[PDB]
């Protein structure tokens, strides 16, 4: 298959900025005829993809002159000369030369804002869940920027990796932040075998980590 690679996979943008995304294919896209079939589609959340640019450099009918495409053979670029809000979403390059037809994995154009530290909240298992045999410890890490964050669970000062389920929101519409939920699921028995529970966040807003911890027995 032809392998479309896009760079970067995420692009933080301020409204008004110029934006450039590259698409490198694994092999030349020139046909038996001289015309190349390299396209750029875009997709907004909850919506279907939309065609933007075709034959490397040609805008689809009704696609603003801010959307510019250029390149040949193996490296391609898409340019947006002044990013507007409606431009935010995911961009895919696409080849229709050889079967199977393939898309790149996408480039998420996202909104830039000032760094923010996450508001971390840790939650012990509910007594209702314990009664049923399970023990979930949940950690909310809310309203942070940039979206790059890392979560570490520690039990009695020892790192725990297994049984951890993470979930991340989409960038918020009003405050441009991101939030994350991280759940550590144990058996009730394992939960009770230990005391100290710590959710640890590492995020560029501080050299020192934000941690929330609780101790099972004494509260």
């Amino acid at each position: 298959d032809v392998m479309m690679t896009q760079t970067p996979l995420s692009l933080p943008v301020s409204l008004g900025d110029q934006a450039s995304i590259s698409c490198r294919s694994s092999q030349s896209l020139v046909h038996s005829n001289g015309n190349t079939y390299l396209e750029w589609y875009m997709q907004k959340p909850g919506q279907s993809p939309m065609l933007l640019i075709y034959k490397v450099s040609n805008r689809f009918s009704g696609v603003p002159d801010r959307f510019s495409g250029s390149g040949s053979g193996t490296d391609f670029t898409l340019k947006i000369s002044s990013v507007e809000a409606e431009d935010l979403g995911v961009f895919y390059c696409f080849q229709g030369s050889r079967v199977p037809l393939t898309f790149g994995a996408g480039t998420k154009l996202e909104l830039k804002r000032a760094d923010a530290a996450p508001t971390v909240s840790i939650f012990p298992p509910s007594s209702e869940q314990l009664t049923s045999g399970g023990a979930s410890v949940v950690c909310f890490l809310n309203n942070f920027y940039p979206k790059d964050i890392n979560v570490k669970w520690k039990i009695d000062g020892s790192e725990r990796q297994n049984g951890v389920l993470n979930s991340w929101t989409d960038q918020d519409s009003k405050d441009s932040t991101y939030s994350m939920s991280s759940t550590l699921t144990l058996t009730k028995d394992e939960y009770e075998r230990h005391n100290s529970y710590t959710c640890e966040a590492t995020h560029k807003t501080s050299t020192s980590p934000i941690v929330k911890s609780f101790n099972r027995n004494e509260c």
Partner: protein, 226 residues
């Protein structure tokens, strides 16, 4: 002017046959240069092209699914079909149908797309959510605002809907996308309210799982020492 609409069952078990329909308007399938492709997107992930059928009933498939795929047409009825045999878990996706530019040579220019239909393939049985209230640590934090939570664990299928105080507690709320724990789904939600609000007033998490006709209310209540 040009519209496309996809339809089919939203849930199948592994090994079953998925039969999808693309119903369209604004162009006809029996004119030169017209083509209809099926493309799918797993949640979060990228698009994957599946099959293309031409104005002249010429066809083209993804070789990586070829033995399971059959693209078909009812030009009279404005209907394009796809048949996928032996469904497995990884056939879980939104399936789109789309017509090409409409000029002459067709593997490109997908300008018009349907809405997409969600097909989920699972061997899981319908399961009501377990809903647990998440009270702040059994401690004494003195902050101006307080964060509470609600854990919705072990349900099939999606969706669940989650409100607070019957939708009348709306802001300070982060409700996270479901994640799939072992055939079963789980999600959580947080609220941040003022400390003068809670526990002084009632905050309850409201969870509906339509598919199983369940509604659960779970009042967040201060923890005890045990």
């Amino acid at each position: 002017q040009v519209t496309l609409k996809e339809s089919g069952p939203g849930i199948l078990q592994p090994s079953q046959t998925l039969s999808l329909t693309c119903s369209f308007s604004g162009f006809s399938l029996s004119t030169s240069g017209m083509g209809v492709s099926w493309i799918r997107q797993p949640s979060g992930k990228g698009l994957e092209w599946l099959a293309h059928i031409y104005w002249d009933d010429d066809k083209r498939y993804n070789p990586s699914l070829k033995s399971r795929l059959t693209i078909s047409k009812d030009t009279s009825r404005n209907q394009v079909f796809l048949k996928i045999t032996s469904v497995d878990t990884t056939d879980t996706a939104t399936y789109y149908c789309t017509r090409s530019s409409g000029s002459i040579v067709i593997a490109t220019g997908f300008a018009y797309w349907g809405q997409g239909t969600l097909v989920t393939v699972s061997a899981a049985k319908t399961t009501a959510p377990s809903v647990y209230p998440l009270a702040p640590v059994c401690g004494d934090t003195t902050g101006s605002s307080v964060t509470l939570g609600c854990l919705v664990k072990g349900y099939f299928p999606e969706p669940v809907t989650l409100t607070w105080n019957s939708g009348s507690l709306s802001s300070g709320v982060h409700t996270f996308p479901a994640v799939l724990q072992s055939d079963l789904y789980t999600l959580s939600s947080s609220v941040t309210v003022t400390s003068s609000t809670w526990p002084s007033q009632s905050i309850t998490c409201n969870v509906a799982h339509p598919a199983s006709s369940t509604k659960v209310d779970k009042k967040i209540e201060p923890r005890g020492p045990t």
